[PDB]
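Progress note, project year one: complex with zinc ion.
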Amino acid sequence: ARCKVCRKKGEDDKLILCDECNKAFHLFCLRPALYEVPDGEWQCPACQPAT
Ligand SMILES: [Zn+2]
Ligand SMILES: [Zn+2]
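Model obtained:
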């Protein structure tokens, strides 16, 4: 629907909000390999650890 990165409707698969700071993100825009929901990484790249 919408996503704070691209701000575009198209790849409207299974969007994910970051729990911490409520940024709406596509699984694509979060991580290009990611297509299914991470029931754990309820995060966005900034919040996700450098590991
Ligand atoms: Zn997006
Ligand atoms: Zn975040």
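The chain is about 10% helix and 10% strand.
The helical segments are 27-30.
No further modelling is planned for this target in the current period.
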